[PDB]
Amino acid sequence: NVTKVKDTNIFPYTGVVAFKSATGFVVGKNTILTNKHVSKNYKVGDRITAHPNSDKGNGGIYSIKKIINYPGKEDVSVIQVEERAIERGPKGFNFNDNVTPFKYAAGAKAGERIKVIGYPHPYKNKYVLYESTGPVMSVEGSSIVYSAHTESGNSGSPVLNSNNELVGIHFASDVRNAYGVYFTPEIKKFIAENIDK
């Protein structure tokens, strides 16, 4: 099922950020992940909003300071933001006080239930977070395939397991199956190198 997120300012939803019409999520200090197909539309200096709710409340508005695409076929891009918010969140100006990074799941298997969390319906200045659930269909190398309903606004969605641990990043749907990048060692390493320090 696909359900509107009741509280966008508690964990794990405090790990999600909104671009104008796609999603990303927090991986470390001043650092978010999304798809190359989303960040190709952005530039350094553009804004993202941390965990917005329906009614103009959020974890602050932050300016992108760097965009680092993963060198590989996989649809993964690292975005760093300026630590000091353009507009403060409720925990003040510092990005890192307002958001919560995810931790990697140990792995994932066909049959297990995952959640895809993002913004599948856009609006005139209104972000609504949804959570979509469904079983994993397979995992091979850097591909994780899941049957859970998504829309183009889910570009860049974290994919989480039952325990809210990170199993992949959503990038594509059909038309049915939807497709995320699974975090292989090679990909985790590029992310670790490129998290702000």
Side-chain angles (χ1 to χ4, degrees), residues 1-3 5 7-19 21-55 57-87 89-90 92-108 110-123 126-175 177-197:
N1 59 68
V2 171
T3 55
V5 170
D7 321 74
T8 58
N9 68 355
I10 59 176
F11 183 84
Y13 309 110
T14 50
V16 183
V17 309
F19 293 87
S21 65
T23 310
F25 58 90
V26 180
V27 290
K29 180 193 188 168
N30 309 326
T31 306
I32 278 148
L33 219 53
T34 183
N35 303 136
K36 307 170 170 160
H37 71 260
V38 175
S39 60
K40 77 151 157 11
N41 295 319
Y42 286 84
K43 66 184 193 293
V44 165
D46 281 349
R47 276 108 191 249
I48 63 95
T49 301
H51 56 84
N53 185 279
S54 304
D55 47 70
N58 59 52
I61 294 179
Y62 300 89
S63 63
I64 295 179
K65 66 174 177 175
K66 205 168 174 199
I67 298 174
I68 311 125
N69 280 9
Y70 176 60
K73 60 170 158 158
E74 290 90 347
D75 205 350
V76 179
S77 182
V78 169
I79 317 282
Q80 299 182 359
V81 297
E82 279 297 337
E83 195 151 337
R84 175 192 179 77
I86 299 318
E87 259 156 65
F93 275 95
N94 191 305
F95 180 75
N96 306 294
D97 287 327
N98 284 288
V99 301
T100 53
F102 297 108
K103 86 173 265 254
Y104 286 126
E112 81 173 90
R113 227 92 220 299
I114 51 75
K115 309 182 213 198
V116 184
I117 305 167
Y119 313 88
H121 308 125
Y123 302 90
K126 192 189 71 191
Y127 305 105
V128 186
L129 198 64
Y130 289 80
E131 171 163 308
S132 181
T133 65
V136 174
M137 316 298 314
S138 48
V139 167
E140 344 266 5
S142 64
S143 186
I144 181 167
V145 181
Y146 31 93
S147 163
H149 176 93
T150 51
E151 299 296 345
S152 75
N154 288 116
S155 280
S157 295
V159 188
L160 310 182
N161 68 17
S162 263
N163 200 36
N164 289 327
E165 307 154 344
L166 182 68
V167 293
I169 172 173
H170 177 73
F171 73 103
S173 59
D174 293 329
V175 289
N177 283 352
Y179 301 94
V181 174
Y182 190 78
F183 295 111
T184 56
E186 174 178 25
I187 291 174
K188 294 189 173 168
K189 176 171 83 79
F190 161 86
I191 287 166
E193 298 166 335
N194 285 284
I195 285 153
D196 196 25
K197 280 161 200 103

